Design a protein around this ligand. Sequence first.
Ligand SMILES: Nc1ncnc2c1ncn2[C@@H]1O[C@H](COP(=O)(O)OP(=O)(O)OP(=O)(O)OP(=O)(O)OP(=O)(O)OC[C@H]2O[C@@H](n3cnc4c(N)ncnc43)[C@H](O)[C@@H]2O)[C@@H](O)[C@H]1O
Length: 186
Amino acid sequence: AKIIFVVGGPGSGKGTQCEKIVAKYGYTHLSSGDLLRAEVSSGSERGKQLQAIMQKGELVPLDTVLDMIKDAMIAKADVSKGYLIDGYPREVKQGEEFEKKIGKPCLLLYVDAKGETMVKRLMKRGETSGRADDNEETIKKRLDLYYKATEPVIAFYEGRGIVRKVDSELPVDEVFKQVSTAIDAL
Ligand SMILES: Nc1ncnc2c1ncn2[C@@H]1O[C@H](COP(=O)(O)OP(=O)(O)OP(=O)(O)OP(=O)(O)OP(=O)(O)OC[C@H]2O[C@@H](n3cnc4c(N)ncnc43)[C@H](O)[C@@H]2O)[C@@H](O)[C@H]1O
């Protein structure tokens, strides 16, 4: 099955574009954030540890997040023609370990937004939906971590040759036209 990495900053619009991909193409959307938050909601001790880390805007250990991604892929294996891996990899080692344990991506969709745009979108969502990490101090930490740890992921897959950038400053449906173009050309 096809594996597509979807990578971009906090609030760049990854999840929004992924849900549109699902509706149009039928791919299986796996969000590392959603999987982690599901563990938090379980009330487990691990969930309490994950909640602490995520509330501070920090990266969860590779071992945990890759386990959950693999778990989810296996659970959907019978019915998936392709996978959207949304929010993983966030560091080069995460990409490397995924390829070691699961397989290689055929495409990385780089959902590109401005830093100020991401701050605005997350501040707005925070005031609306009240997600714990959508507070101003944590947003700043998330964005800084994205720049430091995750942008080298883009470079890695540029070296691989599979990055297609989409301009997430555009309206959602206009971004999705760029997304659709990349997927159609697979
Ligand atoms: N691999 C990993 N390794 C280690 N730790 C990990 C990990 N993955 C997760 N974690 C941990 O979990 C935490 C959270 O991870 P995660 O859940 O992946 O959070 P995130 O990376 O910050 O992504 P978001 O869901 O916040 O934003 P998004 O890019 O999907 O944008 P969205 O479509 O929602 O849109 C955002 C807002 O903007 C709106 N919007 C979207 N697109 C547009 C557009 N074109 N125009 C106008 N508004 C738009 C949306 O309606 C919405 O309101 C991490 O910080 C980390 O602690």
